[PDB]
Subunit: 379 residues, 4 copies
């Protein structure tokens, strides 16, 4: 049977508890009698859709975390239409990332929550917490950055231009539009012919899994100004990592101001987010950092549920400046890195108490079942 969101993918039980123009907040039904006091808010990429994190039941990171006894909230992004063709990077920071933190924290009744980002979700959520810290607000107990670029050095975009030249910016706000985006071709063509040829080639000549291809093919639109800002200030000019260089939502962005315990994950054969580029976050972030390297590629490495006991991962408590030095002292362990992370997350999440009986609270009651209608909208 073909893949269908809400039928055989993204089926972990939950409810939409909040929605605005930019996103729906999902809250998942408890699967345990007790849960940690502090919930986990997941911020997935808005390049493709969130359900790479809740793919099928056996492979779902959401379901796994719920079964370890955490309350999980998740940002399901709107797939923007013409009405959002002028949305900016700042709009997304304020009205989705910061808003989601506020609503999840309100529902939880806790002073602090745990947060997670994946891929550009990690870049987004890190920017949001840096904005909040400059406002004097510290709503996060800890941060998990899965496969996240903060330092974009050596991602390859300028390679073909370095040796042109003789031997001797225009504001993003001026753009409007919706640009198709996907993960595996985010720095590659996105057109009918490329998509046709690449998809057909991979399905017949490689073991790339079909549910990955379905997720990647379920494309999302990026608003013009948002895509412009992201391309300009990260991949091209690499300014987010320069403390105070960028102003976002009225304040300078200094990633060191986040200043909470942070778990930083990358995959060794990942060529979308090089693992050395993820590791470069250890030079930027304050407080107690942990870096963990999973084996294999961009998705295969992150989505490696422990039950199957496949692959491996490396740990090293020392954090030298150079990633090769880190790997030289690292120990390889059999199987999934997920138990390493969930044990770390448990230490950040407070004591276990009786699970909630209902979704949301008086202010934010259930709207409709997870996965929600936003994730079903086509580009």
């Amino acid at each position: 049977s073909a893949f269908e969101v809400g039928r055989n993918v993204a089926v972990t039980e939950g409810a939409v508890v909040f929605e605005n123009e930019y996103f729906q907040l999902l809250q998942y039904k408890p699967l345990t009698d007790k849960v940690h006091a502090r919930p986990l808010l997941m911020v997935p990429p808005c390049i493709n859709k969130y359900y790479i994190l809740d793919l099928q039941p056996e492979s779902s990171l959401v379901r796994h975390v719920v079964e370890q006894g955490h309350t999980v909230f998740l940002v399901s992004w709107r797939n923007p239409d013409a009405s959002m063709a002028g949305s900016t990077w700042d709009d997304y920071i304020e009205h989705a990332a910061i808003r989601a933190i506020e609503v999840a924290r309100d529902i939880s009744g806790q002073d602090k929550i745990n947060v997670l980002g994946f891929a550009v979700g990690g870049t987004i959520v890190s920017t949001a917490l840096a904005v909040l810290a400059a406002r004097g607000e510290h709503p996060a107990a800890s941060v998990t950055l899965l496969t996240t670029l903060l330092d974009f050095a050596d991602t390859g975009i300028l390679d073909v231009f370095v040796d042109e030249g003789h031997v001797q910016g225009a504001p993003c706000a001026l753009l409007r539009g919706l640009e198709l985006a996907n993960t595996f071709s985010f720095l590659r063509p996105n057109d009918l012919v490329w998509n046709y040829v690449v998809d057909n080639y991979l399905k017949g000549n490689t073991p790339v899994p079909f549910d990955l291809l379905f997720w990647n093919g379920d494309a999302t639109n990026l608003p013009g100004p948002w895509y412009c800002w992201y391309l300009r200030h990260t991949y091209l000019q690499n300014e987010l990592k320069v403390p105070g260089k960028l102003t976002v939502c009225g304040v300078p962005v200094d990633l060191a101001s986040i200043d909470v315990p942070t778990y930083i994950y990358g995959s060794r054969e990942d060529h979308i987010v090089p693992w050395t580029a993820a590791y470069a976050s250890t030079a930027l972030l304050a407080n107690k950092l942990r870096f963990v390297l999973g084996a294999s590629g961009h998705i295969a490495g992150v989505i490696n549920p422990p039950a199957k006991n496949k692959r491996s991962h490396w740990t090293n408590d020392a954090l030298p400046e150079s990633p090769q030095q880190w790997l030289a002292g690292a120990i390889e362990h059999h199987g999934s890195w997920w138990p390493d992370w969930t044990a770390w997350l448990a230490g950040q999440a407070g004591a276990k108490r009786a699970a909630p009986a209902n979704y949301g609270n008086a202010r934010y009651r259930a709207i409709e079942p997870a996965p929600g209608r936003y994730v079903k909208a086509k580009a």
Copy 2:
């Protein structure tokens, strides 16, 4: 003054002597009293337009070759519109590459002509001569391949997919359409935001020259089936280099059947056509081969006129299997590789005779002045 094709770029004097739906054949006015008996037919890429080879007068390869005493013909590709949305790779081989060889050879009155390809023009013209050889036809005295991919190994398209998968084609003729193409982003996004951000970034933060950016920004459309075939059978499946694997215009393609003296050029810092990938052509082609490596990038290396006496180039008469072995024995020479090539081309071009007084011949008289109206058509 802004760049304008036919006013301050692509201004070498000439005439259109033939045209069909796919291209116009240009013939340039002699600048010398005598010319070699055999003319040179240039086949430029149809990704962007031909005039990278006739950019400004100081930098024009066309003008330089005409001033060395060769009759030059050149393929100026149609910029396809809706009527050509179904054109195929075979259509282009038969009705443009092979057709241009036939018309140029007819006008010249010679039994054989010299041919040149640049970038995908070199792939196109090599395929055409292999098709012709299988028909028992040998219209070329020699072939010059500038910055040409024939073996597409290690061009990078499959990199992000190699480590996806668990631990354990649809015909191009079905597509229609016109897809925007340019050279520096042929394997990169082509959309309004990318083009805006990249162009603005390069102009303000790099010495990439403005006439290069103008040429690259002067985009061309690729017909759906053509783009599908090119992507599938070269970059993805790398089959052109497998003798007899591909059937084109009714015959198997064996690049070894071209079998004429061949000059093979690449640029050392070229990351669009890696110089080692150009060098791999030496393993495929029969007859007497010469490989020459120019310093610098994709365009800077090829467009290096000798008058300025800039950069350098390497030569080595030995042709080991490995490019690093070639470079280890190579000698570096000061300045442009153009004199090396034109001296080689003179040896293929026959004796010098009085230059022609008029364009074309009785069958093919002048239609309109170079650069012709096809090259002025926008995508």
Copy 3:
């Protein structure tokens, strides 16, 4: 307890059945009631000693193969002294590799034997079989090449010399001597200070295993002319892979003349024998080839016994010219590649018969117990 050859490493039960100036032939005691008709002759490197293949009982490749029901013979190289300071590459081919094939085949009473090489042992044994084929002799049923260089392209020795030069051999037989050699620093310094600093660094700051370091530290001498020939004609001039280019023991060496079923193994993170360099053997060898890629480094990848169920390996029955194309279509399987190989080897080894009661035969009776005295000799 410290490592000691014959006490807690290299302890698989066996006997020396033959010896000359160059090597001792070991034959291991059967561990099964029946064995395949055709035995396996292992040719280990003479850079360091053989017992990387019989390290500790849990990690021993020899013991594993004996327990799968093969008679195993093995070349234990002399550690040369002053009397051998003039030994040549040809001497080793004739008086050790070819001699070992002859003696093992004689003892077995079989028309053909299976052979295995590891690292330079694979280069040696491939050269020997190519020499034998040119003599009209085909003593091998199949060949297993573990981590073997035949095509030495891109091994890195010329890298630092490629860009020296202005902008514009002495016979190996003349050398005498013994040069210290080890595996991990074969292309690196071998001196008291390097060995002291590197060993101390690895033991205190990495998980490199101590038995690996013991084996690597148990250095062997290379005769001057042998080391000269190996360096010159493989790493530097890469001529073994050129059919007929080199003359060895009176005949031209054409590796395609070996022409038997061949199993070719490499390890993905191996930077001593790059896996792509091992893969390049598929372009040289005739008959039915299988290529298998193990995960991890030079030794960790090869020495991965299946009982522990660690790591992974890739298979692909297609053999494209390019290794990246091979990997793109490859399937990753959990755990050790050893079962893949032993199942392949069983298909080459004939039917199972009662195991031999005694070592050797009338001509070659047991001399002394394995591991033999040659392997205990210090450099």
Copy 4:
């Protein structure tokens, strides 16, 4: 005529003005009527000998600087014998680098001198100035680092060990000895066979120049403890770049404490000192930095005298963290970088005054002519 130090190489006119067990201080004869008030002290590598900087007259950096009107002093290292087999890194810092600064400064009568280092000479002289700064001493007006490693990340020594290990220091002062060293094989074998095969191969099959090979073949001894310390604390543990991590001559080493205008040079195709590794010095050093990239290899790039007008070099006044960003904004200029540097050096060297009539001063009179007897001593 064969190369001979003091006859046709290292012939710039000068005198030894000081000597101790570790080195001779050379002072060159003026070639101009006036010289800058501040002299330049050159600290060459002690791996091979100094005269790579005074090779032949046309190629001599020393002669070129003297002809631009600077007084040049130079450290000519002792080639250590058995009496120095216990010399340490600290011994060399105190009794050669710091001593040479003191003597050159005394002879000059100036409060500050300019200093230059090349290769390990740059590492040595940077350490010495950092030691002096911690003592409250600032004898340098400016520093020139040619092809110098300070940050040794990614130099490749740990590559072969990173993927060994299961799935789960001894003081340098204890060594004695003299270890042969050269530049192009400093991380490669140094033995009779390697040297024989490599030298013979390069001379017959590459354009590597013979005077380079002569210099490289003129090997120097490294004392055991010195070589141990250098290997351990730079290439292996990369600690010099960690402020205060290493204690040298009784004080912590913080390279930021040097704090003088600094010219940092690297060569683009240099694989002994990667240009990106040289560039990494810009992250360590205080005060006004300039980085300049020369084209070509380790020696070809540095030794590029301007008279011949060969090669090119890049400049960029911006200093981003990433070297690729630096190169993307860099402008390529024709020919040698030497005029760029000497113009920079003139700005550091004070006003021009009448040249000295005699070598040295009352305390330090001429001992013997340059090049001196130390440089003639064989290993």
